[PDB]
A paper describes a structure:
The spike (S) glycoprotein of SARS-CoV-2 mediates receptor recognition and viral entry into cells. It forms homotrimers protruding from the virus surface and, once engaged with the host-cell receptor–human ACE2, undergoes a substantial structural rearrangement to fuse the viral membrane with the host-cell membrane. The S protein is also the primary target of the humoral immune response during infection.
The proportions of the Beta S-open and S-transition are ~53.1% and 46.9%, respectively. For the Beta S-open, the angle between the up RBD-1 and the horizontal plane of S trimer is about 70.8°, slightly smaller than that of the Kappa S-open. In addition, its RBD-2/3 shift outward relative to the counterparts of Kappa S-open, resulting in loss of contacts between RBD-1/2, which, together with larger gaps between RBD-2/3, makes the trio of RBDs appear to lose constrains and be more separated as compared to that of the S-open of Kappa variant. Collectively, for Beta S trimer, the S1 subunit RBD-3 movement could be transferred to the central S2 helix bundle through contacting the HR1-CH hairpin, accordingly, S2 could also be involved in the collective motions with S1 movement, not seen in Kappa or WT counterpart.
Author numbering:
A (entry chain A): 972 to 1068
B (entry chain A): 14 to 69, 77 to 241, 245 to 247, 255 to 294
C (entry chain C): 295 to 620, 641 to 676
D (entry chain A): 730 to 827, 848 to 874
E (entry chain C): 972 to 1020
C-alpha cells in the first residue's frame, strides 16, 4: 500500500480508490495475524508436550520413585525436589552414582 | 580578488584515517537504552580522507567535486575557517551557496555572485578594537538574484589567536536529500598535531536548508589581494556513502557507540 | 449483559462460567493542542495582489515559517474561477502544524491543472518543478483567458516539456538549453529523434479549457520533525493530564492519555519513540515540559454469570482497565462490577485472574 | 506455561475506522477463528499449571522441630523473612530469568494475567 | 466480491470482467480451506498424542 496509516490513504485517494489500498492492508495484516496464531498453535504443542513431561516427572520423580533410566537424571534416582521458576519449573534430583 | 595569494600552492594529496568520524544523529527521535540500525549517507569507519593544511608560506584551497555527499573535518586554533562555498559552476551563471561564520551565527546566502579566483574577506586594523570581525568582501564583486537567505542559531566561539598544536575541532556533514540540505555540526576541543586523533563523538543537528540548488563541486572559504595571507589551520574532506550503522542510544538520547556492519 | 453472552454463544441458555463478549475502550472527551504564541503569518493573501505570475520554472516564492497561515485575509471562498482542492482547506490549515510554507505563483494551461497533485507526476511535475509529498493544501486557480491569452498563442511565458529524467519532490531544473529529451541521449543539438526541450504556450482565447491560461497558487508544506509554533487562532483548550484526549504535539496527531515524564530530551530532539518505533514521549513546544504519550486504556469485557437454570445475576468484568464511569470493586485483573468482595477463601468456581475467583452464593 | 495473549481482530488490523470495520465483515468468520484459537491457548496454558504445579489439594507445612539426619534443607525451603515466599535457590531462579508488558498493550495486544500467582505457585511447590 | 454465489457473478459480469470477481472468491476460499486443513493438522497432532 501507500502508507501504513489509514489516515494518509483517506486524505489522498478517493473513497472508491481508498478501499483498494485498505484491502491490501487488511489482507496483509490478516495474513500476518494468521501467521502469528499459527506459530502460537505450533509452539502450543511443544509447551504442552513439555508440560505433560513435567507432570510425568513431577509424579514419578518427586512424589514416588521412578526406576526408569535417564528419566529422573543420570544415575539411580532417590528423591526429587521441585522448584518454582518463571514460565516453567526446575527439578532438583538426588541420584546415586 | 582575481589574483591568488603569493603563498598559494597545490599540496600533494596525502591521506589520513578517520576513526569513528561520519556518525551523526539521523533525526530528532529520542531513544533510551535501545539499539537502532539505520541506513543513510555515511562516512565508513577506517576510511581515507584527503590530508590538507593551510598556513601563513603554504596555502592550499583546491576545488573538489560533490556527488554522494561530503564530510567536513576542521582542526582549528583561532578558528580560521569561516565556511564553505557551494554551487554548480561556482559563478554568476547559476546559484551559489556561501557560509559566513562571524563566531555568533552561521549566515547562509544563496545568490548570484561574481566569482573571484581566490575568495577572501578582509580583516584589518587590529591596533584598536580587534573584535576579530569580518569587514571587506574579496569573495564576490557583485550580488543579485538572491533566491534564498537564512540565519542560524547563536553559539559560542573563541577567535583569540593561540600557539602550539591544534585545539578546536569542528566536524560538519553536508548532504542533499530530495533537495533539502541537512547540515549537522559538532564542536569539541581536542589535542592534535597532525593527522587525526582516535576518538568518538556524535554530530548534532545544526541547520535545515530547504533550498534545492544543484551542486557539482565545492571550494573552501579559508580566510584570516595578493598581499593577504592565511592563518594556521588544517582541514580534511570526506565523502559520504550509503552504509548501514548500528547506533547505541543511551538514556540521555545520545550516541555512545557506532558499528559499521559493511566493514568487517 | 446476560443477553450479550446469549448473542455471543448463539444460544438462549448460558452455562455457568466466564464468557467474553465485547471490548471496552475509552473515547477521547477533549482535543488538546498546545503550542507557543504567534510570531509571523504566511503570505496567503500577499501573493494574490501581484500584477502577474511568472512561468512554471520561474515561480516566485516567499518563505514565512511558523506554520499558522494568515487566517485574517482569505480570498479562497468563491472569489476566483475554479477551485480544485486536496486535503484540507486554508480555513482548515489552522488545525494543522507546518514548519515552512512556500507561497508559489505560476501560470499553466487547462490540461496542467488536473496534473497538479502532491508528490505525483505530470508535465510540469517531473520536468519543471515537483511538489513535495507534504502538500495538504488547496490548488487555487483563476481564469486568465481574457487577459494573459493572445490570438495565435502566447509565447511570453516558457516551460520545459522534456527532461532526461523525472524530478524528485522539491527538485527544480531551470535550464532552457537543448538537452536529452527521451530515453536515448541525442548528444546536444536537436535531432536523432529528440525534440527541443523548451516549449511555449499555445493559448488561444477561442479554444477550450485546455488552452486557457490559469494562474495557480500552491502553498508548499513541510511535515518534517521541525516543530510548528502555532495551531489555529484558538490554541490551548487547556491541557489536563490523566485523561483520554486527542492531541497534536509538534506536528504529531494522536489519541491517548497525557502524563508528565521526567525524561531529558536533547534540545535538538523534539519527540521520542519506544522499541516498537511508536510514539513514546513528546516535549512541550510552548514551555519546557516532557509529556509521556500513552494510549487510552482499553480491555475486554467478560460476563460472569451462573447457569441459566440457576440465576440471572450477572457480574461484569473489565480486564486490565480502570472504570472511571460507573458494587464496583477493583482487583489485580481489573474493575469488577456486580460482585461482592468476601475476605474468606473458597474453592475456585469461576476463575477470573491473579488468584481471584467468583462464585454464586448467599 | 507461556505468556497468555489475546488479540482483537478489529483493533489490531484497523482501529478507530468505521469504513475499514465494514470491510472486515466481508471476509467472514476470521475473527471468530483467530480469537477462539488464541483464547484456547490461554486456557491450555492455565491447564498446564494445574496439572504440573499443584498435584494434590492438601497443603503440607514444615514442622518447627527439624532433625533431618544431617541434611540442611534451608536452601530448598522458603524463607518466611522475605516479603515474597521463595526459597534460597529460587532467589537465583527468579533473578537470572528476565515495561515490555505494558508496551504490548499499547498497540492493541492484550496480555492476560495468569490464574496462579507467584505466591500460589510457590505454595504448591 | 459482489456476491458469494458464483452464479450471480457468471450471470452478470462479462467473461473478461467476471475473472476479477471470481479470483477474489477462489483465493478467499483457498485461504479458508487452507486454514481448515492447517487447523486439522494441528488437531491431528493433538489426537495422535
Amino acid at each position: 500500500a501507500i502508507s501504513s496509516v489509514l489516515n494518509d490513504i483517506l486524505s489522498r485517494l478517493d473513497p472508491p480508490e481508498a478501499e483498494v489500498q485498505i484491502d491490501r492492508l487488511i489482507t496483509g495484516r490478516l495474513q500476518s495475524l494468521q501467521t502469528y496464531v499459527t506459530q502460537q498453535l505450533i509452539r502450543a504443542a511443544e509447551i504442552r508436550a513439555s508440560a505433560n513431561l513435567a507432570a510425568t516427572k513431577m509424579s514419578e520423580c518427586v512424589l514416588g520413585q521412578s526406576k526408569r533410566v535417564d528419566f529422573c537424571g543420570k544415575g539411580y534416582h532417590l528423591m526429587s525436589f521441585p522448584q518454582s521458576a518463571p514460565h516453567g519449573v526446575v527439578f532438583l534430583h538426588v541420584t546415586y552414582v | 580578488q582575481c589574483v591568488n595569494f603569493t603563498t598559494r600552492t597545490q599540496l600533494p594529496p596525502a591521506y589520513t584515517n578517520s576513526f569513528t568520524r561520519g556518525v551523526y544523529y539521523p533525526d530528532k527521535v529520542f531513544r533510551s537504552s535501545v539499539l537502532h540500525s539505520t541506513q543513510d549517507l555515511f562516512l565508513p569507519f577506517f576510511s581515507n580522507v584527503t590530508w590538507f593544511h593551510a598556513i601563513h608560506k603554504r596555502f592550499a584551497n583546491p576545488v573538489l567535486p560533490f556527488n554522494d555527499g561530503v564530510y567536513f573535518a576542521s582542526t582549528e586554533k583561532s578558528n580560521i575557517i569561516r565556511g564553505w562555498i557551494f554551487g554548480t559552476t561556482l559563478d554568476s551563471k547559476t546559484q551559489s551557496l556561501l557560509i559566513v561564520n562571524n563566531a555568533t551565527n552561521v549566515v547562509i546566502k544563496v545568490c548570484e555572485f561574481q566569482f573571484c579566483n581566490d575568495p577572501f574577506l578582509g580583516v584589518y586594523y587590529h591596533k584598536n578594537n580587534k573584535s576579530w570581525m569580518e569587514s571587506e568582501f574579496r569573495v564576490y564583486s557583485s550580488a543579485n538574484n538572491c533566491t534564498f537567505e537564512y540565519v542560524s542559531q547563536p553559539f559560542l566561539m573563541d577567535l583569540e589567536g593561540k600557539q602550539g598544536n591544534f585545539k578546536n575541532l569542528r566536524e560538519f556533514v553536508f548532504k542533499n536529500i530530495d533537495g533539502y540540505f541537512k547540515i549537522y555540526s559538532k564542536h569539541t576541543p581536542i589535542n592534535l598535531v597532525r593527522g587525526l586523533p582516535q576518538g568518538f563523538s556524535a554530530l548534532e543537528p545544526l541547520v535545515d536548508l530547504p533550498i534545492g540548488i544543484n551542486i557539482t563541486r565545492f571550494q573552501t572559504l579559508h580566510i584570516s589581494s595578493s598581499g593577504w595571507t592565511a592563518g594556521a589551520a588544517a582541514y580534511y574532506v570526506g565523502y559520504l556513502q550509503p552504509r548501514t550503522f548500528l547506533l547505541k542510544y543511551n538514556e540521555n538520547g545520545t550516541i555512545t557507540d557506532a558499528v559499521d556492519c559493511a566493514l568487517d | 449483559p446476560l443477553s450479550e453472552t446469549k448473542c455471543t454463544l448463539k444460544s438462549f441458555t448460558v452455562e455457568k462460567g466466564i464468557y467474553q463478549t465485547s471490548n471496552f475502550r475509552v473515547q477521547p472527551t477533549e482535543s488538546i493542542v498546545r503550542f507557543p504564541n504567534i510570531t509571523n503569518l504566511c503570505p496567503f493573501g500577499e501573493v494574490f495582489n501581484a500584477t502577474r505570475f511568472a512561468s512554471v520554472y520561474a515561480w516566485n516564492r516567499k518563505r514565512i515559517s511558523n506554520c499558522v497561515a494568515d487566517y485574517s485575509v482569505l480570498y479562497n471562498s468563491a472569489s476566483f474561477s475554479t477551485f480544485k482542492c486536496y486535503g484540507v482547506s486554508p480555513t482548515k490549515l489552522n488545525d494543522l502544524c507546518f514548519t515552512n510554507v512556500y507561497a508559489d505563483s505560476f501560470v499553466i494551461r487547462g490540461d496542467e491543472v488536473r496534473q497538479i497533485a502532491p508528490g505525483q507526476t505530470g508535465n510540469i511535475a517531473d520536468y519543471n518543478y515537483k511538489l513535495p509529498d507534504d502538500f495538504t493544501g488547496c490548488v487555487i486557480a483563476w481564469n486568465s483567458n481574457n487577459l494573459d491569452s493572445k490570438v495565435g498563442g502566447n509565447y511570453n511565458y516558457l516551460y520545459r516539456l522534456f527532461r532526461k529524467s523525472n524530478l524528485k519532490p522539491f527538485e527544480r531544473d531551470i535550464s532552457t538549453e537543448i538537452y536529452q529529451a527521451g530515453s536515448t541521449p541525442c548528444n546536444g543539438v536537436k535531432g536523432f529523434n529528440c525534440y527541443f526541450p523548451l516549449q511555449s504556450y499555445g493559448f488561444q482565447p477561442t479554444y477550450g479549457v485546455g488552452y486557457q491560461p490559469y494562474r495557480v497558487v500552491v502553498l508548499s508544506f513541510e511535515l518534517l520533525h521541525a516543530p510548528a509554533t502555532v495551531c489555529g487562532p484558538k490554541k490551548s483548550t487547556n491541557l489536563v493530564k490523566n485523561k483520554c484526549v486527542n492531541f497534536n504535539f509538534n506536528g504529531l496527531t494522536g489519541t491517548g492519555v497525557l502524563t508528565e515524564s521526567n525524561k531529558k530530551f536533547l534540545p535538538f530532539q523534539q519527540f521520542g519513540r519506544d522499541i516498537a518505533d511508536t510514539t513514546d514521549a513528546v516535549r512541550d513546544p510552548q514551555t519546557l515540559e516532557i509529556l509521556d504519550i500513552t494510549p487510552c486504556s482499553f480491555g475486554g469485557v467478560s460476563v460472569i454469570t451462573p447457569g441459566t437454570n440457576t440465576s440471572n445475576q450477572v457480574a461484569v468484568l473489565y480486564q486490565g482497565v480502570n472504570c472511571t464511569e460507573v458494587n464496583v470493586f477493583q482487583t489485580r485483573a481489573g474493575c469488577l462490577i456486580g460482585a461482592e468482595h468476601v475476605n474468606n477463601s473458597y474453592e475456585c468456581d469461576i476463575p477470573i485472574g491473579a488468584g481471584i475467583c467468583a462464585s454464586y452464593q448467599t | 506455561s507461556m505468556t497468555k495473549t489475546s488479540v482483537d481482530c478489529t483493533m489490531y488490523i484497523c482501529g478507530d475506522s468505521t469504513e475499514c470495520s465494514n470491510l472486515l465483515l466481508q471476509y467472514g468468520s476470521f475473527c471468530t477463528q483467530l480469537n477462539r484459537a488464541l483464547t484456547g491457548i490461554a486456557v491450555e496454558q492455565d491447564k498446564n499449571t494445574q496439572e504440573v504445579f499443584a498435584q494434590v489439594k492438601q497443603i503440607y507445612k514444615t514442622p518447627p522441630i527439624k532433625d533431618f539426619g544431617g541434611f540442611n534443607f534451608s536452601q530448598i525451603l522458603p524463607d518466611p523473612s522475605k516479603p515474597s515466599k521463595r526459597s534460597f535457590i529460587e532467589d537465583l531462579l527468579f533473578n537470572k530469568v528476565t515495561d515490555l508488558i505494558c508496551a504490548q498493550k499499547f498497540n492493541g495486544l492484550t496480555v492476560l494475567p495468569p490464574l496462579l500467582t507467584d505466591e500460589m505457585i510457590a505454595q504448591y511447590t
